[PDB]
From a paper:
RAD51C is an enigmatic predisposition gene for breast, ovarian, and prostate cancer. RAD51C is a central member of the RAD51 paralog family of proteins that share sequence homology to RAD51, the recombinase during homology-directed DNA double-strand break repair (HDR), and with incompletely understood functions in this pathway downstream of the classical cancer susceptibility genes BRCA1/26. RAD51C binds XRCC3 (CX3) to form a heterodimer, and separately with RAD51B to combine with the RAD51D-XRCC2 dimer into a hetero-tetramer (BCDX2), whereby all paralogs except RAD51B are considered essential for cellular survival. Yet, recently RAD51C replication functions distinct from HDR functions were described, including replication fork protection, fork restart and fork reversal.
In addition, we solved high-resolution crystal structures of apRAD51C NTD to 1.6 Å and nucleotide-bound apRAD51C CTD to 2.3 Å. Superposition of the apRAD51C CTD with the apCX3 complex show minimal structural changes, so our analysis here focused on the biologically relevant CX3 complex. The NTDI mutations, with RAD51C R258H located at the beginning of the G264S containing α-helix, point towards a disordered loop in our structure. This disordered loop corresponds to the L2-loop in RAD51 that contributes to and becomes ordered upon DNA binding, implying possible impact of this region to DNA binding. We tested single-stranded DNA (ssDNA) binding of purified apCX3 and apRAD51C proteins. Protein-gel-shift analysis confirmed the ability of apCX3 to bind to ssDNA. Using fluorescence polarization to more rigorously measure DNA binding, the data shows that while wild-type apRAD51C binds ssDNA with an affinity of ~1.25 μM, the RAD51C R258H mutation dramatically reduces DNA binding affinity ~30 fold (~36.5 μM).
Author numbering: 74 to 283, 299 to 345
The structure:
């Protein structure tokens, strides 16, 4: 066996893991969380929490190994604007607090070493943000990612928030529209596999009232029912459609309890 580098061995180990949501209920229906090497899709109407969950995932991928995490970094591709930097602060801060609790309680002198470096700021530093304003910019950026990711093997998650927004307009040539959309999917599948990371795509079209999606291994639909929030597992390897409750808090995505 070999030659492999120790870096190759670390990436194969990560390959196996999932990125927690901070909702025990979301984690259960996802199989432990958002899986690496796969594309996961979050659908729902405006205000359901696509971006909140995206941001929660971008923070969570950075949780250290000694707290059960992936300990990777994130790319966040924003195609819509109206990004609130202060939300990522709130979320990051609560994830730091949560690990500080485990390190102090149930005591390990290497969790105290990680706490040295796991701050709200180090979490914001580990998220690489790009703004795209149209589909052509988005296509050009994705073409550029193999390079970015060679320079940044820390990257374990790529968010595109949202995939649908730059395709919401009429194309004259419809055959071109699907070509381009089937190509992005294949580009995303390729990255997830060759760079051993999760691709997380946000989408408006599929709501709890509603071709593409074939490439997504998991599709979650986030919606409202009465006065609470729910996530439906709409597509998964098990093929069983379970809805679980969740809430959004200043800390981020949490269980209802
Ligand atoms: N600090 C906060 N505490 C609790 N809920 C929040 C907070 N900030 C935003 N929200 C909730 O998050 C929602 C916005 O979710 P967002 O992820 O932007 O939706 P979208 O699916 O359109 O991306 C708002 O409806 C509000 O209900
Ligand atoms: Mg949003």
């Amino acid at each position: 066996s070999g030659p492999v580098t120790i870096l190759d061995l670390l990436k194969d180990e990560r390959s196996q893991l999932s990125i927690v949501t901070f909702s025990e209920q979301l984690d259960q229906i996802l199989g432990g969380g958002v899986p690496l090497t796969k594309i996961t899709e979050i659908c729902g109407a405006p205000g359901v929490g696509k971006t909140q969950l995206s941001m929660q995932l971008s923070v969570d991928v950075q949780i250290p190994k000694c707290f059960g995490g992936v300990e990777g970094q994130a790319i966040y591709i924003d195609t819509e604007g109206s990004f609130i930097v202060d939300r990522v602060v709130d979320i990051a801060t609560a994830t730091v607090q949560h690990c500080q609790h485990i390190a102090s309680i149930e005591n390990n002198a290497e969790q105290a070493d990680s706490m040295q470096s796991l701050t709200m700021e180090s979490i914001l530093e580990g998220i690489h943000y790009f703004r795209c304003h149209d589909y052509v910019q988005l296509l050009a950026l994705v073409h550029t990612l193999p390079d970015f990711l060679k320079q940044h093997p820390q990257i374990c998650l790529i968010v595109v928030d949202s995939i649908a927004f730059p395709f919401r307009h009429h194309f004259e040539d419809y055959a071109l529209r699907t070509r381009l959309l089937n190509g992005l999917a294949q580009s995303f599948i390729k990255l997830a596999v060759d760079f051993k990371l999760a691709v997380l795509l946000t989408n408006q079209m599929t709501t709890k009232i509603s071709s593409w999606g074939h490439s997504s291994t998991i599709r979650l639909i986030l919606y409202w029912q009465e006065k609470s929030r729910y996530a439906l597992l709409y597509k998964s390897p098990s093929h069983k459609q379970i809805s679980v409750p969740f809430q959004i808090t200043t800390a981020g995505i949490r269980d209802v309890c």
